[PDB]
Amino acid sequence: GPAVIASIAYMDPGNFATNIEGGARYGYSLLWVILAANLMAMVIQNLSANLGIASGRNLPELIRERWPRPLVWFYWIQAELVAMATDLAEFLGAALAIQLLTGLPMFWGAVVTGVVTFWLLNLQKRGTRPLELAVGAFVLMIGVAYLVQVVLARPDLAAVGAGFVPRLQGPGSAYLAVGIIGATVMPHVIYLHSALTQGRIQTDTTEEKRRLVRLNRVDVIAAMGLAGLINMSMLAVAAATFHGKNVENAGDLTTAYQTLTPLLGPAASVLFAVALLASGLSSSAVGTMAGDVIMQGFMGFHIPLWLRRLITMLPAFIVILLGMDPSSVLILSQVILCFGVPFALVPLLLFTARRDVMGALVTRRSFTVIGWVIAVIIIALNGYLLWELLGG
Ligand SMILES: CCCCCCCC/C=C/CCCCCCCC(=O)OC[C@H](O)CO
Ligand SMILES: CCCCCCCC/C=C\CCCCCCCC(=O)OC[C@H](O)CO
Ligand SMILES: CCCCCCCC/C=C\CCCCCCCC(=O)OC[C@H](O)CO
Ligand SMILES: CCCCCCCC/C=C\CCCCCCCC(=O)OC[C@H](O)CO
Ligand SMILES: CCCCCCCC/C=C\CCCCCCCC(=O)OC[C@H](O)CO
Ligand SMILES: [Cl-]
Ligand code: NA
């Protein structure tokens, strides 16, 4: 199931942190970012899936086989830094949820998260299917809980409507908008989606290829449509809960359960932390898997899976020992992810426009143009953020 295993990446602790902080701090004014980032991810992941189906190779493999050696090395290094920033929010997200449930310190929440992840990687595919369905049950129901709560919260509809008009509000709004974009336009999934779809054809025919393109387009847009509604609901619920009210630590993930207290009652604290834990544990295991596939595609070899798991844990323990706020680091990691998006888009936009790669499945010129517009917008947002964080 290519869409379902990677689907948890669109509901990782990074999405929780950016949705809650965005609503509590900036009200409904960033709803247009979630809508834009979700629409971009529809185009981008469609192209990524169409690359694996049409060519039979994933994006890192094609970069390795077609581009000069130093450019490939640069692309592996930046994708490796994307994998670490992706794992930091997910690993620390599960570690934070351990604290919300047991009260353990973050260091001990990370140790438990460390033991579970190490134990989770050794398991086979048949033993993880009950766990993958279980985490899907927790996260989906919490998502549906926000879809229902956004109605019951009675949000100010004048503010909700104005939030869909693209507007920024200070240098801090650009920082969180970039974090929202990276939390939905995830570069590691841009490389991963082309590998999930490679090797799903039956008789190598163009007719079988177009069919998998049609079927994937239906599944991606439907799943992205659901995740987008959940993300906007969670931000809108967080806005109706905390924005304007003078609540201490409003937007932090330790108090995010209060968004569902009128609906779930005293159970809201546990049901949010369990969903945050299942979100962080599964997406961290998926990312470690994806990080292995991406390295094998770029370099033709990999490091042992236990070594990759151990390396990506170090920035999580260091952040804990520095006393940094976990919700802050979750947001920052999503910001770093959004900076690796243009690097992923450039080969994706070039390869899906070539006939010697796609065959009869060359992307229509209009969507290639839409793809380059998306790349330019994200480059400019990353340039406006970098500029405002330096000076002026
Ligand atoms: C369904 C999930 C969609 C999520 C998309 C992003 C959030 C924007 C949606 C707002 C709908 C809220 C409707 C709640 C009712 C509107 C309030 C109203 O019209 O008056 C009711 C009155 O206050 C009672 O007495
Ligand atoms: C085809 C798949 C669906 C798209 C995938 C994402 C999932 C749903 C996203 C948004 C729902 C519609 C929200 C669009 C914004 C409606 C509010 C609006 O535009 O009117 C407000 C007015 O303009 C203020 O002045
Ligand atoms: C002035 C501020 C910027 C101005 C506005 C942004 C324009 C620059 C952004 C992208 C360039 C478009 C890249 C065009 C490269 C595609 C053409 C091409 O070479 O075809 C691809 C083929 O598939 C490969 O072999
Ligand atoms: C800036 C926000 C932009 C929002 C824009 C929303 C419209 C995108 C809707 C569906 C994705 C369409 C799929 C992307 C293009 C793939 C279809 C295609 O061209 O496929 C050709 C070939 O026949 C097969 O490989
Ligand atoms: C949701 C989209 C909002 C729409 C406004 C956003 C602006 C995006 C830029 C271009 C749109 C795509 C149109 C690209 C037209 C030039 C490329 C093209 O398609 O030329 C081939 C054509 O078939 C020869 O007849
Ligand atoms: Cl307001
Ligand atoms: Na926190």
The 3-state secondary structure of 226-246, one letter per residue: HHHHHHHHHHHHHHHHHCCCC
Distance 155 CA to ligand 4 centre (A): 33
Burial class (CB in 10 A: 0-12, 13-18, 19+), 266: exposed
| Best CA proximity match to 227, nearest among 34, 17, 27, 89 | 34
Mutate to test the pocket of ligand 2, among 164, 185, 219, 234 (most ligand atoms within 8 A of CB): 164
Mutate to test the pocket of ligand 3, among 47, 50, 59, 350 (most ligand atoms within 8 A of CB): 350
Superfamily of domain 2-390: Amino acid/polyamine transporter I (1.20.1740.10)
Burial class (CB in 10 A: 0-12, 13-18, 19+), 40: buried
In three state form, how does the secondary structure of the chain look? CHHHHHHHHHHCHHHHHHHHHHHHHHCCCCHHHHHHHHHHHHHHHHHHHHHHHHHCCCHHHHHHHHCCHHHHHHHHHHHHHHHHHHHHHHHHHHHHHHHHHHCCCHHHHHHHHHHHHHHHHHCCHHHHHHHHHHHHHHHHHHHHHHHHHHHHCCCCHHHHHHCCCCCCCCHHHHHHHHHHHHHHCCHHHHHHHHHHHCCCCCCCCHHHHHHHHHHHHHHHHHHHHHHHHHHHHHHHHHHHHHCCCCCCCCCCHHHHHHHHHHHHHHHHHHHHHHHHHHHHHHHHHHHHHHHHHHHHHHHCCCCCHHHHHHHHHHHHHHHHHCCCCHHHHHHHHHHHHHHCHHHHHHHHHHHCCCHHHHHHHCCCHHHHHHHHHHHHHHHHHHHHHHHHHHCC
Distance 239 CA to ligand 2 centre (A): 17
The reply to whether ligand 2 has any atom less than 6 angstroms from the CB of 223 is no
Cα(302)–Cα(321) distance, rounded to whole angstroms?
30
Which residues have a beta carbon within 5 Å of ligand 7, which is an ion?
252, 325-327
Q: Which ligand is nearest to the CA of 47?
A: 4
* CA dihedral for 160, 166, 169, 175, sign (positive or negative): positive
Mutate to test the pocket of ligand 1, among 32, 146, 150, 235 (most ligand atoms within 8 A of CB): 150
53 contacts 205 by C-beta, under 8 angstroms: no
Give 304-307 contacts, CB < 8 A, sequence gap 24+.
305/121, 306/118, 306/121
The reply to whether ligand 1 has any atom less than 6 angstroms from the CB of 150 is yes
The 10 Å Cβ neighbour count of residue 103 is 9
| Best CA proximity match to 319, nearest among 328, 308, 310 | 328
Q: Which ligand is nearest to the CA of 369?
A: 5
The reply to whether ligand 2 has any atom less than 6 angstroms from the CB of 105 is no
Q: Which ligand is nearest to the CA of 161?
A: 2
Residue type, 205: T
The reply to whether ligand 4 has any atom less than 6 angstroms from the CB of 24 is no
Here the tokens at position 353 are: 């426009």
Distance 177 CA to ligand 4 centre (A): 24
Cα(5)–Cα(315) distance, rounded to whole angstroms?
25
Cα(102)–Cα(188) distance, rounded to whole angstroms?
31
Residues 6+ apart with CB under 8 A from 193: 2, 6, 45, 48, 49, 52
**Cα 188-38-324 angle, rounded to 5 deg:** 60
CA 301 to chain CA centroid, nearest Å: 26
Residue type, 359: G
Backbone dihedral region for residue 261 (phi beyond 0: left; psi -120 to 50: alpha; all else: beta):
alpha
Experimental method: X-ray
Pocket of ligand 3 (CB under 6 A): 350, 353-354, 372, 376
**Cα 86-337-234 angle, rounded to 5 deg:** 80
Which residues have a beta carbon within 5 Å of ligand 6, which is an ion?
27, 159
The full set of domain ranges for the chain reads 2-390
C-alpha atoms less than 13 angstroms from C-alpha of 317 in its C-beta half-sphere:
12
The reply to whether ligand 2 has any atom less than 6 angstroms from the CB of 29 is no
11 contacts 279 by C-beta, under 8 angstroms: yes
Rg of the chain over all Cα atoms, to the nearest angstrom: 20
Here the tokens at position 235 are: 């931000």
Cα(128)–Cα(96) distance, rounded to whole angstroms?
23
241 contacts 23 by C-beta, under 8 angstroms: yes
**Cα 36-42-43 angle, rounded to 5 deg:** 95
Q: How many residues does the chain have?
A: 392
Distance 129 CA to ligand 5 centre (A): 42
Residue 300 has phi, psi (to 5 degrees) of 80, -5
Burial class (CB in 10 A: 0-12, 13-18, 19+), 315: middle
Residue type, 31: L
337 contacts 80 by C-beta, under 8 angstroms: no
Residue type, 227: A
Residues 6+ apart with CB under 8 A from 149: 233, 237, 259, 260, 262, 263
Distance 353 CA to ligand 5 centre (A): 15
| Best CA proximity match to 24, nearest among 234, 325, 279 | 234
Q: Which residues of 198-232 are buried (b: 16+ CB within 10 A; e: fewer)?
A: bebbeeeeeeebeebbeebeebbeebbebbbbbbb
